[PDB]
């Protein structure tokens, strides 16, 4: 009865922008870290940030610190990725998780994935 539904995915040119949007049902995200992790195809996971929406506490990878922005809509139960100056090595399925109040191993629930090409 809990779902994460993804979307936002598709293409764009290098120096790019794109918005991610997360939609939680079953559960209200401010009682949760929401997170987004992406994986390449061929290539492994890799953390990339996560929000406490009750509190509006952020934690990004070093990777993507000052590029990618995590923030939350309480009212539509929905986070959110803004993803700027995207590069060929940002293409990867990227999936928003959830758990209870930086490792996948902590979340509880799984979106369904969306594709982020870069050309
Ligand atoms: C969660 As961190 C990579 O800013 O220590």
């Known amino acids: 009865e809990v779902q994460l539904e993804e979307s936002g995915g598709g293409l764009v040119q290098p120096g790019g922008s794109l918005r991610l949007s997360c939609a939680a049902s079953?559960?209200?995200?401010?009682?949760?870290?929401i997170g987004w992790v992406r994986q390449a195809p061929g290539k492994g996971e890799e953390w990339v940030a996560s929000?406490?929406?009750?509190?509006?506490?952020?934690r990004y990878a070093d990777s993507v610190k000052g590029r990618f922005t995590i923030s939350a809509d309480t009212s539509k139960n929905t986070a959110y990725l803004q993803m700027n100056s995207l590069r060929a090595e940002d293409t990867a399925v990227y999936y928003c998780?959830?758990?209870?109040?930086?490792?996948?191993?902590?979340?509880?629930?799984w979106g369904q994935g969306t594709l982020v090409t870069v050309s």
């Open positions: 929000i406490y929406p009750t509190s509006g506490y952020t």
């Open positions: 079953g559960f209200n995200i401010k009682d949760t870290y």
């Open positions: 998780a959830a758990g209870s109040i930086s490792i996948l191993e902590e979340f509880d629930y």
